[PDB]
Amino acid sequence: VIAAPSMWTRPQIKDFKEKIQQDADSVITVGRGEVVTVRVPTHEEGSYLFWEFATDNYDIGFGVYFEWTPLLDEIVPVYRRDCHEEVYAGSHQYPGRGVYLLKFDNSYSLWRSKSVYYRVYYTR
Amino acid sequence: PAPDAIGDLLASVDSEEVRQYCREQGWIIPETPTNVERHL
Numbered sequence: 001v002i003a004a005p006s007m008w009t010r011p012q013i014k015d016f017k018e019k020i021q022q023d024a025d026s027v028i029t030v031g032r033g034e035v036v037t038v039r040v041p042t043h044e045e046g047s048y049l050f051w052e053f054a055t056d057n058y059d060i061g062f063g064v065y066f067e068w069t070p071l072l073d074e075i076v077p078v079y080r081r082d083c084h085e086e087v088y089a090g091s092h093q094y095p096g097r098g099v100y101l102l103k104f105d106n107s108y109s110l111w112r113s114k115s116v117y118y119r120v121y122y123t124r
Numbered sequence: 125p126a127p128d129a130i131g132d133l134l135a136s137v138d139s140e141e142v143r144q145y146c147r148e149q150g151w152i153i154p155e156t157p158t159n160v161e162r163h164l
Binding site for chain 2: 015091
């Protein structure tokens with residue numbers, strides 16, 4: 001049994017990108033037609049995963065898969081969200097011991113690379 | 125501070141200020157991903 005994720009947005013994109021550039025590299029440049037996958041392993045102490053992402057000039061494909069410990073459950077289906085307008089955020093409870101797969105999918109984009117500002121947290 | 129309470133907090137009210145407060149309170153721990161896969 002897997003719990004449904006929580007998903008929302010918040011209006012301030014500028015404050016987000018400003019702080020992401022601040023902290024680390026933490027910015028994925030997604031080439032034309034490329035698909036980047038960020039692997040976030042689950043924490044024993046941790047119950048929850050939190051993700052935030054935004055883009056500069058264009059939308060990008062985003063979804064979340066959970067890999068067990070190779071079966072794959074679909075947490076967030078991959079669709080095109082507009083992160084250039086606002087910051088997209090979400091959270092999910094651990095189904096168990098495994099690894100989260102954060103998908104950034106630029107495949108549909110012929111001529112345009114995508115700069116992805118993202119951040120990750122976990123509770124406990 | 126229960127995890128589901130932290131989630132409802134960030135979901136209901138969300139800003140860099142709240143993100144930093146939760147961080148400072150240890151309610152959320154920043155995490156660097158282990159690997160980044162690329163492909164076409």
